[PDB]
């Protein structure tokens, strides 16, 4: 997160850390949607060009964390994944369309003050809130600088949804309906963005109707971090929801 602030304790209880057994490292953000299911970006798992292809084996899930680096002794719960499911039509080849993956935990996590699932949007939640100007929130332990620090604590940033045309004209890449961009306009003199290590994390919105937090987007891609006339691209969660439903009542919780 570029131009964010430290998260308050328990502010983002669904926040997850995708962590590399060896070398021991932070690969991406992710999120808890149930006591056995985690939502992340498929690119954090599979990236042929970068020769990236994480197996259920290569990884660990860390839930309940505040601190980036320390092992949070009796607050954080670290799980092992049972199974990984990537979207059958995830396009690593061109624009990362369907940048989504589900992870089934080897054993169910128990909720507590620092560990709590986020809700998946129903078609109406999506309709009322996913509007240009409406602000959503991104969290991560990612880069603070496109390039130079690293936070020691979870960062937060509130970003407005940017209308489609703007998203489209900001890049050479081919934007799809499974994408939405977020970011301030240079005109706006307000900054912020996800950065390296932020991918797979949640883009959440608070419903004004039932006062619940919903996960609208997944930190997907962008060009550099916090650059003028550029925006963050997020996986449109509601659009990929049937896919989500499918895999959970196929082999899940």
């Amino acid at each position: 997160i570029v131009e964010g602030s430290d998260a308050e304790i328990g502010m983002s209880p669904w926040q997850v850390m995708l962590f590399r057994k060896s070398p021991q490292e932070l690969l991406c953000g992710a999120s808890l949607i149930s006591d056995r299911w985690v939502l992340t970006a498929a690119h954090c798992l599979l990236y042929p060009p970068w020769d990236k292809n994480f197996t259920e084996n290569d990884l660990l899930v860390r839930i309940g964390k505040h601190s980036r680096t320390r092992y949070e002794r009796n607050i954080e719960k670290i799980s092992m994944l049972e199974k990984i499911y990537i979207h059958p039509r995830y396009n690593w080849r061109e624009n990362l369309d369907r940048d989504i993956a589900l992870m089934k935990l080897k054993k169910p996590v128990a909720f507590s003050d620092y560990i709590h699932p986020v809700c998946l949007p129903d078609r109406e939640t999506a309709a009322s809130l996913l509007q240009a100007g409406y602000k959503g929130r991104v969290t991560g332990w990612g880069n603070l600088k496109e390039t130079w620090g690293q936070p020691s604590v979870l960062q937060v940033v509130n970003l407005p949804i940017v209308e489609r045309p703007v998203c489209k004209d900001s890049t050479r890449i081919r934007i799809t309906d499974n994408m939405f961009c977020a970011g301030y306009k240079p005109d706006e003199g307000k900054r912020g963005d996800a950065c390296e290590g932020d991918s797979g994390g949640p883009f959440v919105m608070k419903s004004p109707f039932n006062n619940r937090w919903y996960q609208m987007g997944i930190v997907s891609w962008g060009e550099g971090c916090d650059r003028d006339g550029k925006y963050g691209f997020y996986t449109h969660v509601f659009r990929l929801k049937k896919w989500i439903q499918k895999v959970i009542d196929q082999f899940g919780e």
């Binding site: 057994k21 021991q24 680096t69 670290i78």
Partner: peptide, 10 residues
């Protein structure tokens, strides 16, 4: 930089 985790986990 990263602290170490129990290999109950590794």
């Amino acid at each position: 930089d990263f602290e170490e985790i129990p290999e109950e986990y590794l």
